Amino acid sequence: LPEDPRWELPRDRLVLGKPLGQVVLAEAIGLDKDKPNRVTKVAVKMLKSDATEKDLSDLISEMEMMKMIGKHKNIINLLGACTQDGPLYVIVEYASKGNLREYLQARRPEEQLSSKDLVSCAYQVARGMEYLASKKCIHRDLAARNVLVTEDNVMKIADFGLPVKWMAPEALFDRIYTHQSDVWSFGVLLWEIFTLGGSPYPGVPVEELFKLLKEGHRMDKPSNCTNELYMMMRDCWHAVPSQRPTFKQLVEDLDRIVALTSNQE
Ligand SMILES: COc1cc(OC)c(Cl)c(N2Cc3cnc(Nc4ccccc4)nc3N([C@H]3CCN(C(=O)/C=C/CN(C)C)C3)C2=O)c1Cl
């Protein structure tokens, strides 16, 4: 494995901690060459014990793609790597509050989220995707499980450099993935937000779903969701991919809704 000094961190600067789920929590000493006695909590990905050449080359590809995508506050960013003195470690931002799906579920009547919190969560995820889309990145598996939440409740898209129930019909039938299918997935994600982590299409057997969808079946409005946000979901689920809003447009619409949503409802 060849070295890349723009990202290399010496292996002894990383104190490995607990498993996160392979991914471990760790402390990086002097990650910022400016502030060299500072420790920063980071997440580190490395290979499993019985892991194949394929697994290795995918880890590297994911890393290489992360290098190219550049930084955004609403995605999980690359921070460094140890590639030399032993096993490959890929170092990324740590999100202390875990994934959004579990974050939401734990806050069903851990503390209540306001309506404004919920819309602002959607906004942030949309911003992340707007960025990824602007860099011509197609996610393919956008879902609340693939958003992570920081200590400061910043939402960050996960696993963007690499379930049927989040796939646009044209992804579902023809394996055609586009920015537009990701928008479909975002509509499902919106629905997850406003059900506080609900299971999509409850009781619908997977094998029935594409038929149901081609037929025009769509999820009902969550019990506590405005008509406005439900129409956004529905728009994301336009049968015709061209007719769905862009992430650009969703960001603008959500920004306006956030601003009109009080901290008190
Ligand atoms: C190349 O490495 C990457 C690339 C990534 O996206 C391009 C991502 Cl998202 C990761 N992350 C980064 C990451 C950051 N922060 C956490 N925090 C955390 C996880 C679980 C519990 C508490 C905090 N995790 C990250 N992980 C995974 C590690 C397991 N994750 C889960 O969402 C696990 C859910 C199961 N649940 C019961 C804990 C996210 C990752 O896989 C890593 Cl390590």
Side-chain angles (χ1 to χ4, degrees), residues 1-32 36-37 39-47 51-52 55-84 86-111 113-144 146-172 174-210 212-213 215-261 263-264:
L1 255 205
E3 196 195 328
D4 180 357
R6 320 124 91 193
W7 297 102
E8 196 67 13
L9 180 73
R11 171 169 313 272
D12 72 14
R13 299 298 73 201
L14 202 57
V15 186
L16 292 192
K18 66 158 181 264
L20 291 172
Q22 53 171 132
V23 180
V24 307
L25 174 63
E27 287 164 291
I29 305 159
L31 185 53
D32 158 27
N37 308 313
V39 182
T40 309
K41 288 189 123 55
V42 295
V44 181
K45 196 179 209 178
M46 76 194 56
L47 292 156
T52 60
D55 287 335
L56 175 51
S57 67
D58 292 351
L59 186 47
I60 295 157
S61 301
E62 180 173 39
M63 177 181 66
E64 292 301 326
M65 184 271 205
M66 285 195 273
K67 293 177 182 171
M68 301 287 295
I69 271 176
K71 278 193 183 323
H72 193 266
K73 74 165 296 195
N74 297 116
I75 68 179
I76 292 289
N77 296 290
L78 183 66
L79 297 173
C82 310
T83 66
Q84 294 313 300
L88 167 63
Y89 291 162
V90 177
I91 310 155
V92 312
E93 289 173 327
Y94 173 55
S96 66
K97 297 195 175 173
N99 76 57
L100 179 68
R101 183 189 196 237
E102 295 171 13
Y103 177 90
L104 289 163
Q105 287 170 347
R107 283 158 183 80
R108 283 168 168 217
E110 207 57 273
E111 196 168 80
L113 296 157
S114 59
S115 290
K116 194 182 190 83
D117 291 330
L118 290 175
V119 182
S120 158
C121 170
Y123 169 70
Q124 284 176 66
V125 169
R127 290 261 276 189
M129 287 300 309
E130 174 178 40
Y131 179 77
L132 287 173
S134 72
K135 308 303 287 214
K136 327 303 219 314
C137 175
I138 304 175
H139 194 304
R140 302 189 169 76
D141 184 34
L142 179 65
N146 294 325
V147 176
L148 295 177
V149 185
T150 71
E151 185 57 15
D152 299 310
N153 306 300
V154 175
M155 306 291 148
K156 295 187 165 278
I157 291 107
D159 289 0
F160 59 81
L162 282 52
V164 285
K165 288 185 153 177
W166 285 259
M167 286 175 197
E170 71 275 10
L172 195 43
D174 293 77
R175 335 301 313 161
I176 292 171
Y177 291 87
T178 51
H179 298 300
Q180 289 107 320
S181 41
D182 274 356
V183 164
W184 173 292
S185 304
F186 180 74
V188 182
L189 192 153
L190 285 169
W191 185 91
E192 298 179 84
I193 286 169
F194 290 97
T195 58
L196 300 179
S199 198
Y201 314 98
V204 179
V206 148
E207 69 273 14
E208 319 294 1
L209 182 73
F210 170 83
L212 285 181
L213 291 175
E215 263 186 357
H217 176 98
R218 298 290 189 268
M219 286 187 293
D220 285 356
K221 185 180 77 73
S223 281
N224 309 306
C225 173
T226 63
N227 285 323
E228 183 172 40
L229 288 155
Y230 184 56
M231 288 306 98
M232 189 186 277
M233 282 171 218
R234 295 299 296 276
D235 291 353
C236 292
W237 305 326
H238 259 113
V240 184
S242 72
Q243 299 303 297
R244 300 170 189 155
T246 63
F247 283 114
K248 183 184 177 232
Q249 182 60 86
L250 290 163
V251 167
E252 306 182 346
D253 290 336
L254 281 165
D255 175 86
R256 189 191 20 83
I257 291 163
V258 168
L260 285 178
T261 306
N263 266 324
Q264 272 132 89

